[PDB]
């Protein structure tokens, strides 16, 4: 029912209070509280990531680091740290990785996988991390809009055009980690098939013993393309 009626049963009388209430106000307060908590969680995650990257002991700005093709050591370090962070987010008990990862940076179209930048592979029992630095630079350097356009519809030197890039790195590494988890939990054939679909994430990623609950940095907002 739209509204709820409360009547007080007074002993040995007839006069009564018959007060009617709505559920709309309670729903609004519930939604507001939930949105505030989700926003706080997202900001806490971003702060953790930024603090970790800061602890990496790197002198240069992040985008500058990703522009320096001459040295790949820093890029490998950053990618490794972000992957470890995602692993910690899913499974807080375990932090490090059992195996060793060899990192390769690629700077040509031929290496560029058409769309999935952080290609995650393994050969002879050793994980390999392939990276398309030019694609990373292109995404990080698209002049992110800063003007206040909500469009929701239905001391420190950290500008919005920087927090945005940090979040974008988080999202890209997140997609990479999902593909890697699919690879690990099943056969190589499953990983290859999923690469061309992205439609097999529904295996067990829901709230389960093996896959714990998490915001995953992408359920915070529903989104979609507006093509016909």
């Amino acid at each position: 029912c739209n509204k709820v009626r409360t009547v007080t049963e007074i002993v040995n009388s007839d006069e009564k209070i018959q007060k009617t209430y709505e559920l709309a106000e309670f729903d609004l307060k519930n939604l507001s509280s939930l949105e505030s908590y989700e926003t706080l969680k997202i900001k806490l995650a971003l702060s953790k990531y930024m603090a970790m990257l800061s602890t990496l002991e790197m002198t240069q700005p992040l985008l500058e680091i990703f522009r320096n093709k001459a040295d790949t050591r820093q890029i490998a370090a950053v990618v490794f740290s972000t992957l470890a962070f995602i692993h910690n987010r899913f499974h807080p008990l375990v932090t490090n990785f059992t195996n060793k990862m060899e990192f390769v940076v690629t700077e040509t179209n031929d290496t560029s996988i058409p769309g999935e930048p952080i290609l995650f592979t393994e050969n002879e029992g050793v994980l390999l991390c392939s990276v398309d630095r030019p694609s990373i630079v292109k995404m990080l350097s698209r002049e992110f809009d800063t003007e206040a356009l909500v469009n929701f519809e239905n001391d420190f030197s950290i500008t919005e055009v920087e927090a945005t890039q940090y979040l974008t790195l988080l999202l890209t590494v997140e997609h990479a980690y999902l593909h890697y988890y699919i690879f690990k939990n099943y056969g190589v054939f499953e990983y290859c098939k999923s690469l061309t679909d992205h439609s097999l994430f529904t295996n067990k990623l829901r709230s389960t013993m093996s896959t714990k609950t998490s915001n995953l940095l992408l359920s915070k907002f529903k989104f979609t393309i507006e093509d016909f």
Partner: peptide
């Protein structure tokens, strides 16, 4: 605010109803 779904008209209603029922006879 706790974001839980309480007993719509059971827990509070059972509180009032038990209180009043024992208030009678």
């Amino acid at each position: 605010v706790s974001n839980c779904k309480f007993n719509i008209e059971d827990y509070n209603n059972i509180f009032k109803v038990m209180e009043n029922i024992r208030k009678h006879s």
